[PDB]
UniProtKB/TrEMBL annotation:
Record domain Tetrapyrrole biosynthesis uroporphyrinogen III synthase: where: 14-243
Organism of origin: Thermus thermophilus (strain ATCC BAA-163 / DSM 7039 / HB27)
EC number: 4.2.1.75
Pfam short name (any one): HEM4
The protein, known as: Uroporphyrinogen-III synthase
Amino acid sequence: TMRIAYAGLRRKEEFKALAEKLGFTPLLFPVQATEKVPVPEYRDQVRELAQGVDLFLATTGVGVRDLLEAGKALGLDLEGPLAKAFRLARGAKAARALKEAGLPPHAVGDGTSKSLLPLLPQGRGVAALQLYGKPLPLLENALAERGYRVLPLMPYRHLPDPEGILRLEEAVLRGEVDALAFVAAIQVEFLFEGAKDPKALREALNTRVKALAVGRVTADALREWGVKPFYVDETERLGSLLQGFKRALQ
């Protein structure tokens, strides 16, 4: 019996059906509140960024593209200020987006926030931080340490389901799950941030429980929290994640 916990919000019925088709026991453990809250002040944050900053930290390709488009849509010069700024990309996707904008990063990480820490210079003025639904305490705390005021930039807010998060952590730590499928990096992050014992959670997912990730970006978030993903699907198709898992077992 392979008992796979599904952390996603959508495609619950689809996950359950595919699990039983492949001989697994599906368990539903969502970790987010539903759904996208708009951040009304986006737009004002982008206006503030155009006033000029000392550092720009990009986390996602989509987020860089959104920001630059909003800038142009709002009649602002962002390229000016961003070309003078020291520029960091957390991973390859954020780096590609900046490179395509003629603003290639000065420092690129490995997809994890922690890889940026030794690459952050000291240390004055404003660090614009582009963001994908939630605060990034490790990065934000480090930027304060380095001497920067943080200017957060994100169009939408994602919220955790704290009770949901605790139920999933309990289920894992009580040995009631064999594998854990995350379909978004935000799920990984909410789980570990909201867990009572993130360290025990990590050791469990590295030994007895197999962490499954939809896409490299989700796998990046597991690696941030010290988890080696058991399997990572590059297709973003649930049947493919689950067949891939069934295959790797071995």
